[PDB]
Amino acid sequence: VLLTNLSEHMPNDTRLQTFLELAESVLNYFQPFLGRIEIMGSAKRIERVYFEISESSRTQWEKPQVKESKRQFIFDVVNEGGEKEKMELFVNFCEDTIFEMQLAAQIAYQQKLLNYFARNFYNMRMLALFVAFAINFILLFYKVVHYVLEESSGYMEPTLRILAILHTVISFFCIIGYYCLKVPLVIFKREKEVARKLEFDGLYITEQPSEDDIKGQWDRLVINTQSFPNNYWDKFVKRKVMDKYGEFYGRDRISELLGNSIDVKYQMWKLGVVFTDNSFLYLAWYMTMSVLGHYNNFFFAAHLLDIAMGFKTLRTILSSVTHNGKQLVLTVGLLAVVVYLYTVVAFNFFRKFYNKSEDGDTPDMKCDDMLTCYMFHMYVGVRAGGGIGDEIEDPAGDEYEIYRIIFDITFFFFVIVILLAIIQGLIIDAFGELRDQQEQVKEDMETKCFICGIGNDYFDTVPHGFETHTLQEHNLANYLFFLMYLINKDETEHTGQESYVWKMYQERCWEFFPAGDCFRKQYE
Amino acid sequence: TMSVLGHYNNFFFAAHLLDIAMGFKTLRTILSSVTHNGKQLVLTVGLLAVVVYLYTVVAFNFFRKFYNKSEDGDTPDMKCDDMLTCYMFHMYVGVRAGGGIGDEIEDPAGDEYEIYRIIFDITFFFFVIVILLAIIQGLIIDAFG
Amino acid sequence: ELRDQQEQVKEDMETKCFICGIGNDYFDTVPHGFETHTLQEHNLANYL
Ligand SMILES: Nc1ncnc2c1ncn2[C@@H]1O[C@H](COP(=O)(O)OP(=O)(O)OP(=O)(O)O)[C@@H](O)[C@H]1O
Ligand SMILES: Nc1ncnc2c1ncn2[C@@H]1O[C@H](COP(=O)(O)OP(=O)(O)OP(=O)(O)O)[C@@H](O)[C@H]1O
Ligand SMILES: Cn1c(=O)c2c(ncn2C)n(C)c1=O
Ligand SMILES: [Ca+2]
Ligand SMILES: [Zn+2]
Ligand SMILES: [Zn+2]
């Protein structure tokens, strides 16, 4: 570090170069370990910082529980979320990702088994799909009561009965394995958001949140429990509120409010936050059809919709229906009224044309009943290609001839041409827009620096120039390793920077991330 | 190698007309636009072939009695109550039509499943032909666009 | 097009000051910076 810290700080020194060059088995041994950041260090001028990256933590920014959490976060902040909480959303990501890298290290005999399932989750939900093809390939051979036939050999229908009871087993081993891989994380982001709300702000003492914000009201059941911050690493949050609010209000009211055999009020609260978590319910519904898959074999054909949740350019299709969805109900709400408004006119003038019959000798079928004339238009008039002039007798020799051409030629030119274009239009332009936001993030991170926010133009200006600015000088992984490194340092051991940062991290100002300039934007 | 095969049959000199494709510019672009965006194309036809399958399981397990490609019952009536044959009935007739599946299905009027079968058709038109066969054409034209 | 003009007004008022006509870039430059320029310094209700 010392040989580095002069080469970075003082260039144009020929004495140091031959001095540096004989240490090349050392500097090119430690460059795996030499994490560099840049901060605005207390003097209104920006200086480098050098530290130690451990090796048990360089190999846990692999292990794709974390890399899944990175690519969700990176797409989260740079899409929406303004500058006033950009970096505050960064440190709120680095706080959680340390808890994942502790969870990744620990991943009677039951504890040995339970870590086999949380380890192999992504490699087991993939197996729960390949079985569901082999059910819905075998199930294609049915014939009519419904008995299966064979085409290959005699041993076909037992292999369905084997692969069906196997599928309930695997789909039960993918909500066990989900229960010990992601549920401890969503517990942690819930406990932080309650512990950092009653303490730094106070709501169960001062605000008392209303009947709106339901998840505020459910959190009231956990503060009376004993082992409250079970994952939030901060086991003295109970005493910090008493020393903060025990004098404006009673020291006895707070101690009533706060405080083989297990805690029961916490365990009732832990399940209360799993079942409203959105990604867990799909893992339940994917399992509860498997139990229903033995009452009838066809229910393993609803497991093919894991193609939808399981890919990327098919997850976007499924999301495009409800992305623009609020304008969608209001338009179908207009389409169902215009077709109704063309049913009142057709009922009150034109009963005599509506014959779905066969040439009059048949006891002719009519559509002179209001609800049945209504469902005649919605089922035949919309879905046709020419409007309503198809299933209506040809008007030629009639008193209402011109008064009925107008009734058809608007119907085609007001419902099928217009109103069933901007129904398809609000779905395709949803998919045409949502596939662009996931392309801008692919671009907005490759022509801008994340933490500086500078640009590819200024930082290029040398051969191979943006690459080194994001692989040495910022490299936002390093800003997470740095805040992992402060924790293992003793508080007496903090150097000059590492206790101006760590003090600022407690008060949470975040003025020390380099806002505008980096290093080369003030030197030369 | 088609020219050598062009003497075993004269029609094989009609596969040499595709040198119009490799040989121009604004027709080389058409040919390349199919596979330029092609990775999202298989994943979507991979969804279209599953939704139509998922509407075959429902139609097989509830609605055999409507699927008559026959002539008025005195004919030894043709059915579609066989799973693979009901599947290729939807992929060949239900997609390529203009109104979904309410064309080659008998008109449901006096039935116990009347409202439960309008819903089976009006989604099929509003989930496969309107949506899913727009963003199949959409991934080809916006590739060329 | 008409659903876009009602989206630009939703944007042209949230990345510009109405009466200054300055922009979100210059007035941000501090933590929480455009919000106070339009809730104290101009806030066009106050001019009414
Ligand atoms: N501050 C930054 N930190 C890291 N990367 C940055 C930063 N600013 C811009 N980038 C760009 O973002 C890219 C990082 O995204 P990239 O996809 O390469 O990550 P990855 O290691 O490939 O993992 P994944 O593909 O899962 O995201 C870098 O190549 C870099 O060009
Ligand atoms: N000069 C300005 N005066 C007021 N608002 C401004 C001005 N310049 C920009 N703005 C932006 O316009 C927004 C005001 O529109 P906003 O929709 O918030 O009004 P509102 O109080 O919510 O009422 P309504 O929703 O009915 O318009 C402010 O939040 C501000 O960000
Ligand atoms: C113990 N501990 C902390 O003390 C801590 C932390 N993050 C911030 N702090 C302050 N983490 C993740 C942590 O485990
Ligand atoms: Ca010291
Ligand atoms: Zn930078
Ligand atoms: Zn102004």
Alpha carbons B96 and A7: distance in angstroms, whole number: 70
CA distances from residue A274 to A44, A114, A282, B118 in whole angstroms, order as listed = 46, 18, 12, 38
Cβ-in-10-Å burial (0-12, 13-18, 19+) of A459 comes to buried
Tokens of C13: 């008022």
Q: Which residues line ligand 3 (CB under 6 A)?
A: A 95, 98-99, 233, 487
Report chain A residues whose CB lies below 8 A from the CB of B44.
313-314, 317
CA of A445 relative to ligand 3 center, distance in Å: 29
* Residue recorded with tokens 């666009």: B145
By most ligand atoms within 8 Å of CB, the mutation choice from A70, A74, A76, A445 for ligand 1 is: A445
Backbone angles phi, psi at A447, to 5 degrees: -130, 20
Give DSSP secondary structure letters for A200-221.
TT-STTTT---SS-HHHHHGGG
Burial profile A392-423: b = 16 or more Cβ within 10 angstroms, e = fewer: beebeeeeeeeebeebbeebbeebbeebbeeb
Q: Taking CB atoms and an 8 Å limit, are A375 and B118 in contact across chains?
A: yes
Could you tell me which of B1, B43, B128 has the C-alpha nearest to residue A427? B128
Alpha carbons B66 and B61: distance in angstroms, whole number: 12
> Which residues face B28 on adjacent strands?
none
C35 lies within 8 A of chain A by CB? yes
> How was this one solved?
cryo-EM
Give, for A399, the enclosing helix (H) or strand (E): none
**Ligand 1: nearest atom to the Cα of A452:** 1
Alpha carbons B104 and A386: distance in angstroms, whole number: 18
Could you tell me which of A407, A337, A340 has the C-alpha nearest to residue A371? A340
Backbone angles phi, psi at A157, to 5 degrees: -65, -20
CB A192 within 8 A of CB A200: no
Half-sphere exposure of A274 (CA within 13 A, CB side): 18
Tokens of A165: 């009871």
Alpha carbons A389 and A403: distance in angstroms, whole number: 14
* Residue recorded with tokens 């005195």: B74
Alpha carbons A66 and A101: distance in angstroms, whole number: 8
Angle formed by the axes of helices A478-488 and A88-103, nearest 10°: 70
* Residue recorded with tokens 């979507």: B44
Residue B82 carries which DSSP code? B
Q: Taking CB atoms and an 8 Å limit, are B99 and A307 in contact across chains?
A: no
Tokens of B52: 């139509």
Residue A47: strand, helix, or coil: strand
Alpha carbons B89 and B53: distance in angstroms, whole number: 11
Burial profile B53-68: b = 16 or more Cβ within 10 angstroms, e = fewer: bebbbebbeebeebbb
Q: Taking CB atoms and an 8 Å limit, are A379 and B57 in contact across chains?
A: no
Could you tell me which of A436, A434, A430 has the C-alpha nearest to residue A321? A430
Question: With the C-alpha atoms ordered A260, A266, A268, A273, is the resulting torsion angle positive or negative?
Answer: negative
> C17: Cβ below 6 Å to ligand 2?
yes
Give, for A273, the enclosing helix (H) or strand (E): helix A264-274
